[model samples]
Target: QQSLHIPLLKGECWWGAAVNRAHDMPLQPGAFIQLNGDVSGNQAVPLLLSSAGRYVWSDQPFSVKREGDILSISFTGTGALYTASGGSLKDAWGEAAARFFPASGRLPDTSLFTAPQYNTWIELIYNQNQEDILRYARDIVANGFPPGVLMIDDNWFPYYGNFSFRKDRFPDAAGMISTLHGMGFKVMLWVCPFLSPDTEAFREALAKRIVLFDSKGSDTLQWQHAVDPAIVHWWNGYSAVLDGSNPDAVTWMREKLDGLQQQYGIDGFKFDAGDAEFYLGNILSREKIGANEQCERWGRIGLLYPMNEYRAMWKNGGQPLVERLRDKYHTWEDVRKLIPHASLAGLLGYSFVCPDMIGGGDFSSFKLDQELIVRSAQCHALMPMMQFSVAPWRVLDSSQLQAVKNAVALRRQMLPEIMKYTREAAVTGMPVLRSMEFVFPHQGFERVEDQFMLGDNYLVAPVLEKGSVRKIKLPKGRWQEIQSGKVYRGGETIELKVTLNTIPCFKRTT
Candidate 1:
């Protein structure tokens, strides 16, 4: 039954279902959404983006609803609907990301946009060895902190599509990745496309048929195995996946992750779960595709790696891929879901995001409420990449570990306009954390999701609570509060007054 119903005119608003961007984003009010294959983590993109500038394109996986002043879009094969009357969710998300998925202008390893990343999944959970990942990168340079990208999460290679290194807990994976690249750190590792059943790389990926074969044996498939290949069921249990619609299983999972970057200089991958609900209806395929095209073919083998990272993805949004923001907890209700789920991952073009590790990333719900870990590092110090795995010098208390090192020194004092909107989001797919209705469109800022702008030159306001007269709204011009030089004028709605190492950025200055 094909559908496209459309009718929410009164005061329309919408966003897409990138794993429902942290529950009930703009698309609320009788939502009967039914995203297929589905994701429970982050990034999905079948395309929805609206606030009356209109959009709704689909390459696959569909079903959205509004019911009661109806709005619909049901499909399994195809659907398209575009509009732009007076144009607004910022000219319909910059003309639907430059007419669908633009930005691949290469970006992702400028030390992941100038520094502050380090994950060992909540500090060595799953006990990933190699002496606690070289004591979590030598206690982030002996606790003064500075070497970026560390990752190394998820059992440091034992099974699931083995990328090697579990030599009795990595005896010396190329001398601990050349001692974390001589201590400047860049080592990523948590991969997943699944493949653990009866190991040895799933018996050479079942003799090179390139894996995944169970064609529908539904006992509500919770790890149900028995027959030609497929074991599925994730959360780390039964496995044997990797059939990204087989281009020889993504060239045999990119020659087993580029032979771990040609035998141990490894500095990329945290691809965790391709998520299309573990290939439902159970894919059977050299190219029988569509479980959202097998989760965009295992997220395009993370576009070969610029030190990539993902937390489940599908339409590999505007490419320079880094899109994180899933596993969270260690609450203020997960610290008010880091600014409307990273401003809905930059209104779904994903905008190379990463708002999900600082003080969250579930360390069994870490109860270290030191102003909820310095308001989650002043809300990831000016978005567009800032990660950590709960170790503000081994969990706070020295003024909450110097306010998480002064939010990594205001993310290195706005690291050159956050690398100038991360190189204009690799050539204008736009969104290095934008989204005050995608930058002030139809200025009611369509349900302003608790502050964010950054790319148009800072407006950030992330004091998501515990202290603040905090109100903010600023969008026309003249904004200055870059740490209390105070000045605010454009279409007023001020309040400011803070603590917990304030991060109320502004800087438009005109």
Candidate 2:
């Protein structure tokens, strides 16, 4: 075990850990975060960015705590901690990233950045039949939204570990994908690392030692002593988990997924729920590794497929995999978290990230907040990628629906710029949505998370609350407001009256 404490200077704050501690960001003296376990949906990286021109990083997961003015880091086993200072946030991030986890200069499908994506989770849920799915795709174009990547979510598979589509639900899976392709939508399917027991796949996987096994749970083994596979309990239920420490496991998984692509022309996948905590069982693998390493193996599986998305990832920063924010509810509070969390994600080196589904992914939260949905669309409008799960036309009135459409329009207007930064992110390993402090260093912008810089040029301050009036700060440069075509000075805070349709954005003029 190794531990170190670094004293904080006045006004210093830190950002890391997506699915962070309730979005308490730029953590200060009274803040503490432990990213070792249960990193749930949003994903996390073992790196911290500081506004005081400092950073802390480790290849393996570690814990951080603040006592008085001291930031303490605790690392177990054998790994090294990298810390540096005396530069701005940009300097620290640039040096650290270039050295440790440099960008791969590759990105997912370009469509992910150019157009709006639709998911069938909220609309169809477990009933992801081909009928409803094609209807959803048809309606996306009907509703005047461009079809980007459409993901057929869970329950499309016949059962856990069976990567094949359910014949009963998707009778003509290949034909359905062809139809979606004709509709100008690239398609992806949801996948997980869980395998159910009492099935042919489980038995084969057990025999091959591709799934996690319990050496502690005694049984008979052809190689040495037999044992039952490790059964992991998660949100759905108890099931056998793939041994992410085993390379064969990933290879076998890929073979199954490749069949879909090879046979049905499936473009990509939405990787889900391979959280680190699930690997914290008394399980055995072909290799000796910790839980986070297990999670990393599953994350690497996505790299084989260009159009990939992962919800729970560890140390996957700078990779081409698209990461979405954890599922949020349909409320103002969660909506408000969009900016801060997305900004935090960029700071943590997850340059490619999306807000949770528009209007929130929790479809069961029935009482719709029309304003909340509109506000969320605007929040996601200029981010790296925007997604829609709940149909805007179905819930919003004509005016409100138009407001939602306008958000999409705003993204279309800025798609070129978004792709520009997105390409830079893929090459330079920089954030598409940069923190205020990252662009303009030492400007007392550390705690300002409500707004962010879209690349180095655009300053985006979307309305989060119900009301339209907003207060935003500009950096040390000339900025041209998006809606009004008005110019403003940097190093100044300005208040403006905005309508529901206005997304408060400013392009750097100087």
Candidate 3:
């Protein structure tokens, strides 16, 4: 049997494991890789390797073989394998991803997808009110941050399965949406696949067998954050999840969302909590599916909506969908992970990726810290997209608020460039935001994760560590620092002076 071997240099690391550890996984033998073009990095060319012969694309598992200087890939099934190589891993991966570019339908609307967005999760928690949402909108405009999409997060609805607003909390849902629109903001609502039990919607779905059941023909419940004795517990508490694999359930969800859009001017959704863990051991389509498979099917439900966000996805690569990172914490360690996580997302074929909500998503402790929030905002400023959940005006002091406002304004100013790369991504399946290695492939850039390139023209090295100065390595070019207007020739390392407000950004002048 002929095997495929792609070459790798000593100490070279591969970066395409979407669901697993994204950075620095060694390409050792006896490794099993699954590819249906659905795995996070499956669409991202199996980087750090080259093909040996022609191969047909199919959904299956392949194995790796290494014999000291010779590493190879072997598939158990019968099909011709093909090889394509480029000067760098980025080029090679782009070649592979092109096969699935603009994958089968309309691409995301750049106006909405590429714009700065705000979410109500961190600020409002579960206590969403019409007055508060409107106030947030007004605050966004008053703070000089451009108005974009505003997501009314979880618990705004009456219940998990039911899509209507909780009248007591959001009495003027339609009026609220209308006011947001008038203020140049598009409105989105948080949604999940869970259905709270004892509700009319849950009872009806149970009658129709639209909900999933476990192996014993009993209803399955969530394991994490369970607060109730009778029902499953999630972060929201006591809800039963819907079966995404069921056509009836999917159709029902679509209709509910459609009705909201038609009646309340709801523009999009923050589709949350359909992770595979929620589906494990559940029976769907009269059969039991594994966790990973369940995650993939759950991901499909988000594709029906043009503007959406997801955190835990299965394979669903090559499709134009926005994937968010799992929630992070309010610490420096977590803050440092933004670029690494986002770079991994791009490599996994999720081109439109948003970092975790700025200032972190978990609000359990909810103490306000100015420096951490300012640094977090700085980290996301030059990323492909930026989202806010904690109201900056409320949490930040005057100076910190201005710093954040500057960061958002900078992101807005660079939207045209961001959108330019975003358009190319839709056509070629390339990432709008690139890791240093992806752009400057073989010159020892594999280790640079804290620094990233915005498209090919800009380099951003934000201060992730808690210090007043940042040291960074420059790739090959004459780089002009965005804030200082100082130019430096590339292919060397430089130390940058930073203040609480300074995020080191550079334009590739050469």
Summarize candidate 1's per-residue lDDT along 301-372 as a digit string, tens digits: 778787888877777778878888888888777667777777776666778888888878876775467787
Q: What value does the lDDT take at residue 45 in candidate 1?
A: 78
TM-score of each: 0.41, 0.96, 0.85
lDDT of 2 by residue, 416-506 (tens): 9999899989998899988788888778787777788899889999888766589998888899997789999988899979898989999
> RMSD to the native, candidate 1?
16.0
Best by lDDT: 2
Error of 2 at 213 (Å): 0.9
The residue-level lDDT of candidate 1 at 241 comes to 86
Clash count of each predicted structure: 1, 4, 10
Clashes of 1: 1
lDDT of each: 0.78, 0.83, 0.70
Question: What's the TM for model 1?
Answer: 0.41
After best superposition, candidate 2 residue 350: deviation in angstroms? 1.4
Give residue 225's lDDT in candidate 1 (0 to 100). 40
Over all chains combined, what TM-score does candidate 2 have?
0.96
Better of 1 and 3 by lDDT: 1
